[PDB]
Symmetry: C2
Subunit: 660 residues, 2 copies
C-alpha cells in the first residue's frame, strides 16, 4: 500500500442520478470527479445493460449529467453547447438547452429542446411533453421578451442591480442557492409540439417536490409573501383539463413525500405536534374524497442520514411501483431499504451494514449505489437481502492506500445504547501512546456510521486515533432518541464526554494530546465543549453556531429552527436561548481553536464563527479563522477542490501544531 494523503480524494469517484429506461434494459448514472486545474468537477454520463451487466462511458467532455430518458434508446441532458444562448444568459436571459445521446443507434449528442427558463428538475409525460420545476423571479426584467432600446435599458439595469440585494420576506436566502428574495421554485408544463410553456404553481409558491403518473401532476407547495410557514399544501393538476385542485390546505401539515399509487395518493406527513419540526413523518393514504387515513406509523427520517465527505450528487430515495412504496430509513449506523404496500405490510429488503445513497427499481430488479465494507460509492444490485457488486469505480482506492476501518462497538450512556467508533492509527503499536481526534457529526438528527470518511482516514494516516459516536439527538432510534429540544449542551454533551472518557481509558491514547472538531451542530458542540472543559488541547470549529440570538435573525432556517430546538426565542425566555449559546461561556474557554467558515454559508451565518473567534482573542487565547469565498455550508461535502484542500489543510495543520 501507500499512505493516504490529504488530497487523495481528488482520485475518488462519485456516483449520481440512477435512472432506468421504461423497459428496464438500460439504467443511466453519472460519474463526478475532481478537476484541480480548473477547480471544478467533471461530470460524465454512463450506462449499464441490465442483462449484459456491462458499464459504458457515454460522455467525455465533463460537463453533462443525465436527467431523463426520452425513450429506451435515448438519454437527454442539459448543457451549454450553444455559444449564442450562453452570451444571452450572461446578459440576463434565462435558457436551458437539452441534448440527446443515442445508445441504440449511436452518434453524438444533438440539440433536442430549448426552454426559456432556468430549470431545476425535469420529468417526462411523453416525447413532446415535460413537467418542469424552474427558477422564477417575481422582479424579473424578462430579457428574453425585450428588444430595441428597452433591451439595452434592461441590460444596464440588470448589470447595476448586481450591486444590491432587496429583502422583504423573512427567508431572504437559502444555503447553496444564494439570495432568494421574491424568487420561487415554480412548476411548469412544456409542450414541445407547440413550444408552449405553461405555469402550474402560482408566482409565490416554492415547489419542494412533484410527481406524475400519466397526465396528472402531484406536487408539494409552500406559499408565502412575507413569512414562510412551517406547513406545506398538497396540490394536483391535470395537463388536459388544466384544473388545479387543493388536496390539503396549506396550514395543517408539513409533507415530505407525495405520489400517485394505484387510484389514490400516498403521502408522508406530520402536524409536528409531538416532536416539533423534525418529527418523523407518518405515511398516510388520501382517498378520492380527500380523507387522510394512516397506513404505517413510521418512526424514522425517511432518508439516508449517514454522514460522509465522499459524495457528489444524488438520486431517488422514494419510489412507487405497483402497490408498494419503496423508501429509505436510517436505523442505527446504516440505511434500510423497505417497501410498504397499500395493505400496510412492511417488508424489509436490505438491512446491510453500509449506507444506501439512492436506488431505482424497474421490473422488481433493484439497483442502488452505496458504501459497503468501508469502501467508496459503487453500484450494487439487490437480490434477497444481499448485494452483488457490479461497478469497480473505486475498488483500487482501498487496495492502493492504507485504510483504517473503524472498530464498531455498543456504547451505553444516558439510559440508551448507541454506536461507538474508534479508528486505529496506521501502523499501530500497542507499546506506544498516540494522540486522538474526537469528530462530532454535523446536524443533530444525523448519523455516523461504518462508511468511508476521507477526513478521518487522512488523520489516521498521520498517527492519530479518530473516535466518534452518535449521542442523544442523532437519527436512527426514533423521535424519542432524537429529541433534545431545550436540551442542547446537556445530555448530548454528557454523551460525548462519557464517550471520550470510555475511549481514552480502553484505548492507548495520550490524554494530554486530544483534539476535537465538528461542523454545523458539531461546530456548535465544539464551541460548547471548549467553554465547559479543559480536556482537549486544541479544537477546530467549522460552520458553527455560537449565538442563538444572532443566529435567529441571519439564518435561512434560523427564525423557526432555533425556537424548535432550544424551546426559546430572543423575546420569550431569552435567558434560556442565551444559556444554550456557547458564546456565553467563551470567557472560560482556554482551548486553542481554529475556525472554519464560509462567507455564503446561510445555514450558519458568518457572524457565528466571527464571534467565538473574537471572544477567545479578547481573552488572550490563541485562535485562527479561515473564511472561504464562493462556498457555503456544503464546503466539506461539495466545495471546489482547492477550497476543500485548503479546509483540510487548515484543520490538519492546527492539530499538528498542538497535538504533535
Amino acid at each position: 500500500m501507500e499512505n493516504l494523503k490529504l488530497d487523495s480524494f481528488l482520485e475518488y469517484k462519485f456516483l449520481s442520478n440512477l435512472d432506468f429506461n421504461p423497459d428496464g434494459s438500460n439504467l443511466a448514472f453519472s460519474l463526478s470527479e475532481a478537476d484541480l486545474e480548473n477547480n471544478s468537477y467533471k461530470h460524465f454520463i454512463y450506462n449499464l445493460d441490465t442483462k449484459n451487466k456491462e458499464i459504458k462511458k457515454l460522455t467525455h467532455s465533463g460537463k453533462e449529467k443525465n436527467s431523463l430518458w426520452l425513450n429506451n434508446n435515448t438519454i437527454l441532458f442539459s448543457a451549454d453547447r450553444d455559444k449564442d444562448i450562453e452570451e444571452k444568459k450572461k446578459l440576463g436571459e434565462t435558457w436551458t438547452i437539452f441534448y440527446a445521446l443515442d445508445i441504440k443507434n449511436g452518434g453524438e449528442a444533438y440539440e433536442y429542446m430549448k426552454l426559456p427558463v432556468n430549470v431545476t428538475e425535469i420529468k417526462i409525460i411523453d416525447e413532446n411533453n415535460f413537467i418542469l420545476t424552474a427558477d422564477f423571479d417575481n422582479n424579473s426584467l424578462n430579457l428574453n421578451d425585450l428588444k430595441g432600446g428597452e433591451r439595452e435599458k434592461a441590460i444596464k439595469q440588470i448589470e447595476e442591480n448586481k450591486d444590491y440585494e432587496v429583502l422583504d420576506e423573512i427567508p431572504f436566502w437559502s444555503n447553496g442557492n444564494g439570495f432568494r428574495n421574491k424568487k420561487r421554485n415554480r412548476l411548469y408544463h412544456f409542450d414541445k409540439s407547440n413550444n408552449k410553456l405553461t405555469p402550474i404553481s402560482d408566482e409565490y409558491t416554492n415547489v419542494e417536490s412533484f410527481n406524475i403518473k400519466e397526465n396528472k401532476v402531484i406536487f408539494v407547495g409552500r406559499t408565502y409573501k412575507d413569512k414562510q410557514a412551517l406547513t406545506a399544501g398538497l396540490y394536483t393538476y391535470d395537463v388536459k383539463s388544466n384544473k388545479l385542485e387543493i388536496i390539503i390546505s396549506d396550514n395543517l401539515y408539513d409533507i415530505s413525500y407525495a405520489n400517485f399509487i394505484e387510484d389514490k395518493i400516498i403521502c408522508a406527513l406530520s402536524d409536528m405536534k409531538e416532536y416539533g419540526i423534525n418529527e418523523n413523518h407518518k405515511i398516510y393514504l388520501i382517498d378520492s374524497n380527500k380523507n387522510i387515513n394512516l397506513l404505517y406509523e413510521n418512526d424514522t427520517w425517511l432518508a439516508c442520514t449517514v454522514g460522509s465527505d465522499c459524495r457528489l450528487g444524488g438520486g431517488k430515495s422514494f419510489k412507487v411501483i405497483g402497490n408498494k412504496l419503496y423508501f429509505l430509513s436510517t436505523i442505527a449506523d446504516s440505511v434500510h431499504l423497505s417497501s410498504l404496500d397499500t395493505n400496510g405490510k412492511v417488508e424489509i429488503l436490505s438491512s446491510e451494514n453500509g449506507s444506501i445513497d439512492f436506488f431505482d427499481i424497474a421490473n422488481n430488479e433493484i439497483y442502488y449505489v452505496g458504501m459497503r465494507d468501508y469502501t467508496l460509492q459503487e453500484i450494487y444490485k439487490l437480490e434477497n437481502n444481499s448485494s452483488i457488486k457490479l461497478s469497480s469505480f473505486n475498488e483500487e482506492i482501498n487496495k492502493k492506500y492504507k485504510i483504517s476501518k473503524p472498530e464498531v462497538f455498543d456504547f451505553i450512556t444516558n439510559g440508551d445504547t448507541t454506536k461507538g467508533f474508534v479508528i486505529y492509527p496506521i501502523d499501530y503499536d500497542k507499546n506506544k501512546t498516540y494522540p486522538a481526534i474526537l469528530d462530532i457529526h454535523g446536524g443533530p438528527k444525523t448519523v455516523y456510521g461504518d462508511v468511508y470518511y476521507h477526513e478521518m482516514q487522512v488523520w489516521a494516516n498521520m498517527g492519530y486515533f479518530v473516535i466518534f459516536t452518535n449521542p442523544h439527538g442523532s437519527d436512527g432510534y426514533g423521535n424519542k432518541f432524537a429529541d433534545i429540544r431545550g436540551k442542547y449542551g446537556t445530555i448530548d454533551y454528557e454523551d460525548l464526554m462519557n464517550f471520550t472518557d470510555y475511549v481514552l481509558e480502553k484505548y492507548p491514547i495520550d490524554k494530554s494530546r486530544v483534539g476535537v472538531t465538528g461542523g454545523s451542530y458539531g461546530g456548535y458542540m465544539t464551541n460548547w465543549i471548549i467553554g465547559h472543559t479543559d480536556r482537549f488541547k486544541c479544537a477546530a470549529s467549522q460552520r458553527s453556531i455560537s449565538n442563538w440570538i444572532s443566529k435567529f435573525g441571519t439564518t435561512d432556517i434560523g427564525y423557526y429552527f432555533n425556537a424548535d430546538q432550544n424551546q426559546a426565542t430572543p423575546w420569550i425566555n431569552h435567558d434560556k436561548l442565551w444559556w444554550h449559546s456557547p458564546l456565553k461561556y467563551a470567557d472560560k474557554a482556554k482551548t486553542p481553536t481554529l475556525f472554519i467558515h464560509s462567507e455564503e454559508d446561510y445555514r450558519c451565518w458568518l457572524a457565528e464563527g466571527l464571534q467565538m473567534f473574537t471572544a477567545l482573542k479578547y481573552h488572550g487565547i490563541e485562535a485562527r479563522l479561515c473564511m472561504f469565498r464562493g462556498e457555503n455550508h456544503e464546503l466539506s461535502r461539495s466545495g471546489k477542490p482547492k477550497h476543500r484542500i485548503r479546509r483540510l489543510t487548515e484543520i490538519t495543520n492546527w492539530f499538528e501544531k498542538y497535538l504533535k
Copy 2:
C-alpha cells in the same frame, strides 16, 4: 428658482487637500465631482495665487489629487499613467508613481518618482528625501522581487489567495479599508538619490500620525500582534543617525496629535480614566527630558464634527507655526479655529456660524475651506474673525435651486441648553399642514449644524418638514454633555422625543405623518425608537446597531468601544448589555422600517441590519432591507454616485409610501 432634485448632488463640487507652498505664494487644492456614467469621481488639481486670488485649473484627465509641493513652482501628485506598472499592480506588485507639474514654466506633468509600496500618505523633507506611511503586509509574497518560476508560482498563489481570508488578530478589518489582518500602516524614509526605502516603524506597528521638522520625524504608534490596545506610543526618528527614540511608552496614554514645536514637543494625550476612550485630549508639552507638562486643559474633540453629506476628502485640522498650535474645535453649533502658544495662551481666530473643514497657514495668512451661510464648500481667507469668500465653485446652486435654510433656536432638555433646528417645506403655507422627518446624526459624539445637508434639502423640496437637534452624548459641550456611557437609550432618547414633541406643537406638523431616520448611532436610536414608541408612522434605519453582544465580536471597534459606551460586556453584566440593545424590544415594534446597510461596513457590520429586519418580519410588521455591495459605513458621504442615488431613493420612496 427650480426645485432641488434627488440627484442634484451630481452637480456639486467638493474641495480637498488645501495646501500651501513653502513661501505662501500659492495654495494647491483638489476639486472632486461625481461622474455618474462611470459611477466614480473625477478629481482635478487647482491653484490659488495668494496675491490677487486667481483660481486656476491645472489637471483635466480627472484622476489627480495634489499630494505635496516639490518646490515653490511644482505640485507633486500620484497617478497611473504607466501601463506596465498598472498591470504589475494587478498581478501583485506594490507601486506608486509620483508626477511633478511645474506651474510656473508650463507644460504637462512628468514622472518624478517611483516607490515600490502602496503609499497612504507622503511628506517632503527636501526634493530628494521623503517620509512615508504605506501599506505593509507581514504575509506579502513580495512579487516585486520575484522572477522566473518562483514568480509564476507566486502570481498563481496570490490569485488563489483571493478566495480566502485568515484572521488571527482581534481587529482583523477596518471600515473603508477591507480586511487588515497582519497588515499595518508602516512609516518609511525614501531617498530618491540612491533609491533607498528604509523602514522606521517595526513590522507590527500601525502608524496613525506623523510630522517632520527639518530632518527629524515625530510619529504615533499602535503596536500589537494579537490584540490592539487602547493606548498609543509616541516615538521620534532622526534620518541621519537612523536613531529611534521612545519618548512615551505605548501603555500609558492614547494620543491624537503629536508634533515638533520650537525645541520641544506639543502633544494631545489622555489617560482615559475620567471619561474613557472618547475623553477630550488635553494638550501637553514634552521637554527634552521627556517630562510631560500640562499646557492647556482642552475640553474639545479637536476636530470638525459638524455632519454633512456634501464633502469628499479632507485636509489639515492641525498646524504648528512658530510657537503656536492652530487647531479646530466644534464648540457647539460650529467649528472654531484657535491657537495655543507655548506660554499657554489660547486665542480664538474664528468663531463663525458655519463649519471649518480644513485650513492652512503661511505668513500669518490663514485660508480655509468651509460651509458658511448654508452654502456648499468654498475657499475663504480669515482676517480678524471674519471670512472673505475667494471661490464660487457652488455659488449657482443656492441661486438656481430652492434651498430652505434652517431655523435655529435654543432648546433646553434634561438640564442643558442645546440647539434645535427646523427646515420648513418649500413653498411653505402658514395655514396648510405638512409631514415631517426626524434626522438623527450618525456619530454618537458629533454635531448637527447650520450646514448644507443634501438629503434634508431633497425632502424639504418634496413637501416635508425636516427637524434635527443635538441630544446628550453629542459633541460640542465638553465631556459631561457627551457622557452617555451606560446611558444609551435613556436621556439621549428623551432629548430627541422632547425635541420632537416641542416641534410638533410649535409647527403645523401632521403628527399622524412623521418619519424618523438616521445612520450609525442614529441608526441605533432609530432601532431603539421603533421598539420604545409607535409615534412615527415609518422609519429608516441606516448602517444601524441592533445587538450589542453581536457587535462585540463582529466590528473593527466593537470589542473595546461597545464596552466603553455601555459599561457592560457579553460576560460582565450581560443583562445591561442586552438591555441597551434595540433588538430586545423588536416584539413591541409596530412602525414599518426600511433598513439601509452595506456589505463592507465594518463599523456596524451586516449582522445588525439583518437581525432587526428579520425580527420585524417575524412579528408581522412591514419592513424592507437594501444591501449595498462595494460600499461601507461612508456610503452616504463618499459612496459611488449610483449607490448614493439608490440609498437616497430607497429612503425617499419609503417616506413617500407611508408619509403621503
